[PDB]
C-alpha cells in the first residue's frame, strides 16, 4: 500500500515529552466563573461552535466567548490542551478562561479580544509591504505551534485575526488542531476546501505540519495575485483539478507514485493532462505591484505537491521575501 512519511522537522517533539502534554483525553479541565462573563452580541456561528463578543465584568475588558456545540467529547479536550500548551506563544490566540455555559451545558472558551478587520475588505487593501509583514507574523505562529508538536490543520484567512490599526495578528480556532505523532494516520477531512493540501485531496493519511505550509501558500497566492480564492474548486475533486491546471499533472503523478498512492478512479475522466504554468501567467496590471521575483520564488517553494519538499515555517522565515521586513 502507501509508502510511509515523516515530518522532516520536529518529528519527535511529542514522544520525548511526558504523557500529560499530548494525551488530551486524560486532561483535567480547571473551570472558571461563568458569571464573570457577560455576552454582548453574537459575532458568528460556525460548524462546531458559536462565537460571542463579551465583557469580563471584573476588569471591564472585552473578551470573546466560544460556546462549543455538542459534537464530541474528545475534540473539546484536544482544543483546550493545544491552547494551554501554546498560550503565550508568538501570535497564538490566548485562552483566558474555560467556563461551563449554563444554557448549552457544554464548555465555553474565553479568549483575549482582537479588533479584527474583515478579510474581504482587508485583502483588497494590503500593500506589498503589508502582505510580507503579516505573512511573517503568521510564520511566527506556525513555527511556534509546529515546534511544540502541533499542526493547526485549518489555516485560512478567517482563522487569521488582524488588528490592522495596531499591526497585530492572531492565529485562531484550534478546533481542528492535532498533535503530530510520526507514522500516525490522520483524518483527511480537515481544513477548508480551497486551502486543502494535495495530501488531503488524494486521501494520503500520513501527513504533518507541512499541510499548514500548503494552506499558507494558498493564502499567499490569493494575496499577491488578488484572486480569492487562488484554487477555486466546485468540490474536493475539482479542487485537485484546479491545482493541476497550475502545478501540472506530471508532478502530481510523480507525487502519487513516490508515496505509492492510488488515486480515486473518478480522477481519470476529469484530471486531464496539464503542463506546469509559469507564475508570471497570473501577473497582470492590477496585482503586478504585489508581485516580485522573491514573492514568486517563495510561493513556488510552498505550493509543492510533495509535502516533504515544501518549505518548513522556519525556512520560510529565512526567505529573501522577508528581507524588506
Ligand atoms: O479561538 C477561536 O476560535 C475564536 C477567537 C476569536 C477572537 C476574536 C474574534 O473576533 C473572533 C474569534
Numbering used by the authors: 3 to 327
Report text from the authors:
CK2 is involved in multiple intracellular pathways including the regulation of cell proliferation and cell growth. Recently, we reported the discovery of a new binding pocket, the αD site, within the catalytic CK2α subunit and described the development of a novel class of inhibitors of CK2α utilising this pocket (CAM4066).
In order to obtain a suitable fragment to use as the warhead in the ATP site, a 352 member fragment library, optimised for X-ray screening (purchased from Zenobia), was screened against CK2α. The screening was performed by soaking the fragments into crystals as cocktails of four fragments. Of these, 23 fragments showed weak electron density in the ATP site.
